[PDB]
Amino acid sequence: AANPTNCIAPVNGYFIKTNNTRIVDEWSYTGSSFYAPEPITSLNTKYVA
Amino acid sequence: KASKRSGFCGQGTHIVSFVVNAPNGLYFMHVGYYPSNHIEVVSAYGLCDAANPTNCIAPVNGYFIKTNNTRIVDEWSYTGSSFYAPEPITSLNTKYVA
Amino acid sequence: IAFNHPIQVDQLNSSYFKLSIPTNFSFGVTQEYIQTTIQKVTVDCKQYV
Amino acid sequence: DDCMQQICAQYVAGYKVLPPLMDVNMEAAYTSSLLGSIAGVGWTAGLSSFAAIPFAQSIFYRLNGVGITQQVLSENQKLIANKFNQALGAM
Amino acid sequence: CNGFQKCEQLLREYGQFCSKINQALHGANLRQDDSVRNLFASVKSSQSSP
């Protein structure tokens, strides 16, 4: 509901469970907050999906 | 693979392309968006503000008709977030970017 | 004679500019075949003659 | 008619020259329409949808895209339009 | 050759080759014309705003 929203951003980042913001060699990383911009809300419940 | 860019496929926007086996060759089935109907709508070239942040064109014109309306579809507003729009320095013809 | 005669927008002296907007999706088009390859054939010279 | 008064291909018969199939005036009309469209097409992200954009504005927007000149620098660099006219004159 | 009956009769024997020459030139011109139409098609649909 808040304007800030998590986004896939580059190659499908912010994965379910542990967030896979890290890509290629690194499996997962804590969200930097500069990694993903705030996208407009998309159809689904509580998720862009 | 993508085209989503300038490409060999032509005469339509390259949303997607399909490849099928053809005798002694390859057959292509690209898909192209067609506008069909065009309606001319007066559009502001950006809007300035007393504050340093100003409305600017980003995906499409910042004001399709008036205020902030951003869409390529018939509906000018289309519930645009306006997050995409950048905030450039104030320009000529103040209170407007124009 | 049925050639040219394209739609023309009118330039605006005012800072606001009239813009043509698409209203119908009209998805779909066809693409030309690119040839790609040619037929292969072998001739038995000194026997066919 | 001029050859009878005196091309000679028809009298030779040999080969017959074939017209291009497109009138020069029709081709000129296409180029003039394209010249109008390019000013509208060359606008930030507006592209084809953007229309009625001034030729001077289109040149400035195109210049900003290919080379990242500052907006203040573009205002500071006066006579750029005159230089564009000089380039047309040089050709 | 035209205007000589004997020359025309010999050219009739080689007529099939002459027919192939005319067909090949006609086909090449039609293919070139289609390419010219394709080029002008992209120019067509442009808007002359000013």
Contact B56, B97 (CB under 8 A): yes
Amino acid at D29: A
CA separation for the pair D17, A2 (Å, rounded): 74
Torsion D48-D51-D54-D60 (CA) sign? negative
CA separation for the pair A29, A20 (Å, rounded): 6
The dihedral region occupied by E27, where left means phi > 0, alpha psi between -120 and 50, and beta the remainder, is alpha
Q: Give residues with Cβ within 8 angstroms of B12, minimum separation 6.
A: B30, B31, B32, B33, B34, C29
- Search chain B and give the residue with CA nearest C23: B74
Q: Per DSSP, what are the bridge partners of residue B25?
A: B22
Tokens of B42: 């007066």
Contact C27, B15 (CB under 8 A): yes
Tokens of A14: 């912010």
- Search chain B and give the residue with CA nearest A38: B83
Tally the residues of chain A: 49
b/e map D24-40, b = 16+ CB within 10 Å: eeebebbeebbebbebb
Task: Write the residue in B79, B80, B83 that is nearest to A38 by C-beta.
Answer: B83
If one counts every other C-beta atom within 10 angstroms of the C-beta of residue A45, the result is 5
Q: State how far residue B21 is from chain E, nearest Cα, in angstroms.
A: 25
CA separation for the pair C20, D47 (Å, rounded): 11
Tokens of B71: 């869409």
If one counts every other C-beta atom within 10 angstroms of the C-beta of residue B26, the result is 13
Contact B3, B9 (CB under 8 A): yes
How do strand B13-16 and strand B31-33 relate by DSSP bridges? antiparallel
Element holding B20 (H helix, E strand): strand B19-22
Whether residues C22 and D53 touch (CB distance < 8 A) is answered with no
Q: Give residues with Cβ within 8 angstroms of D27, minimum separation 6.
A: E40
Touching pair D, A by Cβ (3+ pairs < 8 Å): no
Q: Give residues with Cβ within 8 angstroms of D45, minimum separation 6.
A: B57, B58, B59, B60
Task: Name the method of structure determination.
Answer: cryo-EM
Burial class (CB in 10 A: 0-12, 13-18, 19+), C21: buried
Contact B74, B41 (CB under 8 A): no
CA E17, distance to chain mean position in Å, is 16
Compute and round to an integer the Cα radius of gyration of chain A: 11
Q: Per DSSP, what are the bridge partners of residue B79?
A: none
- Search chain B and give the residue with CA nearest C30: B29
The owner of tokens 């450039």 is: B88
How do strand B38-43 and strand C17-22 relate by DSSP bridges? antiparallel
Whether residues D33 and C3 touch (CB distance < 8 A) is answered with no
Cβ neighbours of C4 in D, within 8 Å: 26, 29-30, 33
CA distances from B90 to B15, C16, C44, D62 (A): 36, 17, 81, 20
CA separation for the pair E27, E31 (Å, rounded): 6
CA separation for the pair D65, D54 (Å, rounded): 17
The owner of tokens 């289609």 is: E34
* Chain A positions with Cβ closer than 8 Å to B: 37-40
Per DSSP, B47 falls in state B
If one counts every other C-beta atom within 10 angstroms of the C-beta of residue B69, the result is 20
Find the farthest-apart pair of alpha carbons in chain D and give their distance in angstroms, rounded.
69
**Residue E38: what are its φ and ψ, rounded to 5°?**
-65, -45
